[PDB]
Design a binder for this molecule. Sequence first.
Ligand SMILES: Cc1cc2nc3c(=O)[nH]c(=O)nc-3n(C[C@H](O)[C@H](O)[C@H](O)COP(=O)(O)OP(=O)(O)OC[C@H]3O[C@@H](n4cnc5c(N)ncnc54)[C@H](O)[C@@H]3O)c2cc1C
Length: 471
Amino acid sequence: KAPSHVPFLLIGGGTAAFAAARSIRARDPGARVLIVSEDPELPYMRPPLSKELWFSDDPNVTKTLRFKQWNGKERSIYFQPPSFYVSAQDLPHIENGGVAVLTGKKVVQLDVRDNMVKLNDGSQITYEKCLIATGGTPRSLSAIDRAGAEVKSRTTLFRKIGDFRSLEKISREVKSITIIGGGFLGSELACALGRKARALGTEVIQLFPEKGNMGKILPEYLSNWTMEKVRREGVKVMPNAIVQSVGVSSGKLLIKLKDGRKVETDHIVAAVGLEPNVELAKTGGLEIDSDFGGFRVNAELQARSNIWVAGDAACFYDIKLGRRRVEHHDHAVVSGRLAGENMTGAAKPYWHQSMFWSDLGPDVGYEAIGLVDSSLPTVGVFAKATAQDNPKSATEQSGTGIRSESETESEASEITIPPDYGKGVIFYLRDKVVVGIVLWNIFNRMPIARKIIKDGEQHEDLNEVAKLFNI
Ligand SMILES: Cc1cc2nc3c(=O)[nH]c(=O)nc-3n(C[C@H](O)[C@H](O)[C@H](O)COP(=O)(O)OP(=O)(O)OC[C@H]3O[C@@H](n4cnc5c(N)ncnc54)[C@H](O)[C@@H]3O)c2cc1C
């Protein structure tokens, strides 16, 4: 089925590859683009898998994957209808070109000098320009790694459609599920599973070594508030939990913690970060970053004269922060688009400041930008929330749940300071300069946050700065 040659080859069929395909076709209306995708699905967005797809009373949603946004309006998880793609066989000579996807196929060898890749089925494909957009593989716990096949078979590493379907099934079938990891994803899943368990009368546990949810990122006040929110959903949250081992004890999973607590459960979900998919660097002879992970690229996202990297797999040069890798939807879209533009001769640098967002449900959301690390000095400024300061209202206003879309990618032109907390802004500092911002239930203000960080001025009074965020 695979053609012998394609002008544009995109390795991996995720968010970054789809953005690049769209960019290439916009700039070159007759372009011929092939996406090679190891997963059996056509390109789709990930955020709904831990969010709106769980907030449903319709059993058909697991089959269609057409979810309802917080505003009640339906959207498909897929970036475009399957009929918008051309067949890989037709690609070389179909009038006006198109975008094809080879699903269920892995690129296993990259030969840079020969502009060639080899698939797992032995197929050889040459390219003129290549994007690596392979994303990452979920990290496991060493305690699970060392526990043997039975424990492993009863642990979900949450990333794909397949994991959504298998976990949604498990949540209807078993009595107890344990999430390991306190980050945004672990916490989203805790809230999603918690809501399911309430209707079924079952148990959800979330455990992590930090003092509270998102403890590596949020300062203690807001980390603690989040833990209480998750507890209000019915979830048993266990902070200061260091996993010693995991075994099977008369049919149940048994998690032993260093402090002496034991946790008995039916299934485990791990959400403890990501290992960038860099296997192709071996045969490709490409440099990887041993400190931050990922393929090292220049300002234009090039690994080689005709090889670019975008999305989760890229270790890029952040304009403010230096060598960096992120796991942001926004980054995958903007870096993928830019790769596509540069593959069609734009030669433009990656200067975008990537934003991140998380919704715990329709009532609580976060946004983040820049260097966000709870070990840094911070200043938090908080206020009571208004009726509009929640993900649902933000989605009602914008028409979308993908916040990188509603926020805009832009930075504000100017930021003239105007002359039971439920929202706020948190500034992360270096010598009175703001290097990162977290927004709690404040929407449509990311351009202001980008402007503050880009300008890099010293600020005498952060309480004045907070007025820009309507605090
Ligand atoms: C459940 C979940 C929820 C998330 N929610 C948010 C959110 O709310 N906000 C936010 O900012 N970010 C969120 N993220 C992160 C965001 O989704 C990612 O940053 C984004 O998916 C990265 O896109 P990508 O194209 O780089 O990688 P991916 O989407 O991982 O795509 C990579 C693809 O390449 C395939 N592949 C790998 N190797 C090969 C190979 N050799 N040959 C062929 N194919 C290969 C993989 O199977 C995969 O399909 C979430 C992530 C997850 C998993």
